[PDB]
């Protein structure tokens, strides 16, 4: 999983991107561990 609402549930190697608009958060990982 590469996007979520709990930042932590993302277990991303680098800091996930916060994509917030008005009311709307979501966090997305841009760093990939193969």
């Amino acid at each position, epitope marked *: 999983i590469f996007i979520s609402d709990d*930042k*932590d549930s993302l*277990k991303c*190697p*680098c*800091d*996930p*991107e*916060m994509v917030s608009q008005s009311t709307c958060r979501f966090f*997305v990982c*841009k*760093c*990939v*561990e*193969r």
Partner: antibody
Amino acid sequence: EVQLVESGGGLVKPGGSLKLSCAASGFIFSDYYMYWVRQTPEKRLEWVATISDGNSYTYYVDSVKGRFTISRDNAKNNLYLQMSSLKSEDTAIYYCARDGPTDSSGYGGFGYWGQGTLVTVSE
Amino acid sequence: QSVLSQSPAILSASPGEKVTMTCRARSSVSYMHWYQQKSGSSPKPWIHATSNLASGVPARFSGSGSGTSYSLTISRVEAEDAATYYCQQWSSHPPTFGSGTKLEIKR
């Protein structure tokens, strides 16, 4: 303004150990990952390790694993690199650092760097 | 893993010229980072995400690429630009830095 103030670098005999520590202020320490990154004296730039936030998952560079331990004390806005078993190629400038500001972050980039702390490993 | 090499090593320009420095990767990567550094102090973020200007940074600077080809370019080099520059990706773990190009200025 953000600030990241590294310290306790210095000299150490091959095999020895050292605990670098970096003092963060100017933000909410616990909303960010921290990273240690270093620069060999040939100016080669190596990422060394990453400690998350909230739950605190730690990730290492190979050439280093289970000798160094990254860590955070969120209660003191503080970041640590515990280093054991030092080899001379660990000689370098150690930089603690973190992702950028809002609009310019979340990409795997290092948006603010400490000022460096010099680690020498020698006889 | 995703080892970067940067060309050239030493680029020389007189104040006024455009210069371009390029950063190849072993495979695909969707974002490049550039930091400017000068002796005595630690890398400053220069260009974020392939092509955003880290705040502070002169609009004579620019970045692009994609896939395995990236670069940073100065429209019209100045003197206060003599420095080493470094590329950095984190598309794929671990993250890596290029060995970095050094601009020197003609006079």
